Amino acid sequence: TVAKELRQKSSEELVKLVIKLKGELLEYRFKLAHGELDKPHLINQTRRLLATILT
RNA sequence: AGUUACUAAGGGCUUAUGGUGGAUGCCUUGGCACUAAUAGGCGAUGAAGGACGUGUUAACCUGCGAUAAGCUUC
Numbered sequence: 539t540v541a542k543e544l545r546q547k548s549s550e551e552l553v554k555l556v557i558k559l560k561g562e563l564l565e566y567r568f569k570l571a572h573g574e575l576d577k578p579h580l581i582n583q584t585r586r587l588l589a590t591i592l593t
Numbered sequence: 594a595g596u597u598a599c600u601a602a603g604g605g606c607u608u609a610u611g612g613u614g615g616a617u618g619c620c621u622u623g624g625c626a627c628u629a630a631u632a633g634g635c636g637a638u639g640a641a642g643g644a645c646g647u648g649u650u651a652a653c654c655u656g657c658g659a660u661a662a663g664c665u666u667c
């Protein structure tokens with residue numbers, strides 16, 4: 539399902555996606571370390587989407 | 594003058610009860626010995642075995658490997 543959407547995308551757009559999700563993942567981990575993450579599941583979703591884009 | 598019971602500090606016997614203890618009985622996500630087939634290897638495209646790390650999840654165990662409690666396809 540998600541893999542189909544990324545397959546339609548080109549390569550350059552994918553590397554933009556991976557860097558943006560990397561940045562967001564760092565922010566989520568920092569906010570969690572400050573006790574300011576209301577939604578604690580976005581860390582897992584970011585990592586899975588990151589792993590899928592890598593695949 | 595004569596023959597005399599009561600005493601139980603404590604102990605003994607019988608029976609009943611309580612406590613420590615896990616023997617006997619029943620059972621088992623565990624072992625043992627084989628039968629009928631399959632198969633008889635893995636590794637420089639990095640092995641067997643380990644260390645470390647990975648959670649929204651204290652530690653331990655299991656899974657996994659910076660794509661880290663999972664990724665794609667049929």
Ligand SMILES: [Mg+2]
Pocket residue numbers: none
């Ligand atoms: Mg007495």
Ligand SMILES: [Mg+2]
Pocket residue numbers: none
């Ligand atoms: Mg007595």
